[PDB]
Amino acid sequence: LETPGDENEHAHFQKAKERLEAKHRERMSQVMREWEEAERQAKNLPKADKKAVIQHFQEKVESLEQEAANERQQLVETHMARVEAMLNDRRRLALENYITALQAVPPRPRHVFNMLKKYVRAEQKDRQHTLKHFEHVRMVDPKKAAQIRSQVMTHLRVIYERMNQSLSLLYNVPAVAEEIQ
Amino acid sequence: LETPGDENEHAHFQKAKERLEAKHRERMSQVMREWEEAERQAKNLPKADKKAVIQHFQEKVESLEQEAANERQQLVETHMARVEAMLNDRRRLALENYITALQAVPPRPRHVFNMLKKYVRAEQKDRQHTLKHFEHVRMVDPKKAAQIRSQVMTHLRVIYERMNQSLSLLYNVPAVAEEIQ
Ligand SMILES: [Os+3]
Ligand SMILES: [Os+3]
């Protein structure tokens, strides 16, 4: 995670969640094994002791379940972070590329557009992505999402303003205006 | 979901979440499209109206995000339900199969055990599965999990009692006792 090179991320990301899982079960089952033995003694001990063993290990697992939590979030935040940089970086590019329009003999009307749908579908990936991500916050931590709606509302609005502000660049190139539209 | 036959479930399950996703984005983007147009009018209207349009669609999306929620849970509960029946059904079987031991000439010491690890690893799938499932409740709806810990604690305990109570059937067959152990 702190190094990784194989381009495709879902690959890696999947692999990290994967081994994150092959790791917890390991430490977790060790407790379900330390617990079983544990009770195997409070078997002929007071019922008060039986009870404390239960409450002790009942807490060790919460401990672990917590570690893993954090541990897992730490993974996600990265992905998201890595995902967004891709998404922004691509977008920015298609801008110049779609900016490179298709100026020459017949302004490659098929390229302009070919290029356009890149920007568009791209910028949609943003919107589509910004949204998914949020739903998560809506569920998992309803309060967390409350705070962050004002924040993310602004974002979506930016894309909208941008997108149209992009299409509105045809208001600088008349030929392909009615031509492509 | 109400019919399905292709054995493997993860397959289907994946497919259902899949189309559940190809469906929401559809209805969702329609709102992000009904919203954009909407604001495009409150553009020269009072700032009070601009504000209501915002608050109206801000609520239509919560609506949808809610539908989808429910809609998605409805999927999960099935899977879990289908998953558990597999898990129980298999287990029960390995019991008789592992019960079928390996009685004959040399009580297929390699079969008894071969059979055993089926039961075991099986019953672990239970424990492993019961646990995963719960972590979900711990996160998503912390309160939900609080209620249900007493319930699921009992379960895990049952497997434990069972498992050992199974191995302890060798206390009925002496040959393979020291023989396999
Ligand atoms: Os995400
Ligand atoms: Os599950």
Swiss-Prot record, chains A, B:
Its main location: membrane. Expressed in the brain and in cerebrospinal fluid (at protein level). Expressed in all fetal tissues examined with highest levels in brain, kidney, heart and spleen. Weak expression in liver. In adult brain, highest expression found in the frontal lobe of the cortex and in the anterior perisylvian cortex-opercular gyri. Moderate expression in the cerebellar cortex, the posterior perisylvian cortex-opercular gyri and the temporal associated cortex. Weak expression found in the striate, extra-striate and motor cortices. Expressed in cerebrospinal fluid, and plasma. GO terms for cellular component: amyloid-beta complex; astrocyte projection; axon; cell surface; clathrin-coated pit; cytoplasm; cytosol; dendrite. It is found in: Cell membrane; Membrane; Perikaryon; Cell projection, Growth cone. The keyword Endoplasmic reticulum applies. Changing K125A: Reduced affinity for heparin. GO terms for molecular function: DNA binding; enzyme binding; growth factor receptor binding; heparin binding; identical protein binding; peptidase activator activity; protein serine/threonine kinase binding; PTB domain binding. Proteolytically processed under normal cellular conditions. Cleavage either by alpha-secretase, beta-secretase or theta-secretase leads to generation and extracellular release of soluble APP peptides, S-APP-alpha and S-APP-beta, and the retention of corresponding membrane-anchored C-terminal fragments, C80, C83 and C99. Subsequent processing of C80 and C83 by gamma-secretase yields P3 peptides. This is the major secretory pathway and is non-amyloidogenic. Proteolytically cleaved by caspases during neuronal apoptosis. Functions as a cell surface receptor and performs physiological functions on the surface of neurons relevant to neurite growth, neuronal adhesion and axonogenesis. Interaction between APP molecules on neighboring cells promotes synaptogenesis. Involved in cell mobility and transcription regulation through protein-protein interactions. Can promote transcription activation through binding to APBB1-KAT5 and inhibits Notch signaling through interaction with Numb. Couples to apoptosis-inducing pathways such as those mediated by G(o) and JIP. Inhibits G(o) alpha ATPase activity. Amyloid-beta peptides are lipophilic metal chelators with metal-reducing activity. Bind transient metals such as copper, zinc and iron. In vitro, can reduce Cu(2+) and Fe(3+) to Cu(+) and Fe(2+), respectively. Amyloid-beta peptides bind to lipoproteins and apolipoproteins E and J in the CSF and to HDL particles in plasma, inhibiting metal-catalyzed oxidation of lipoproteins. Promotes both tau aggregation and TPK II-mediated phosphorylation. Interaction with overexpressed HADH2 leads to oxidative stress and neurotoxicity. Also binds GPC1 in lipid rafts. This is Amyloid-beta precursor protein. It comes from Homo sapiens (Human). The lineage of its organism: Eukaryota, Metazoa, Chordata, Craniata, Vertebrata. The chain holds residues 379 to 559 of 770 of the full protein.
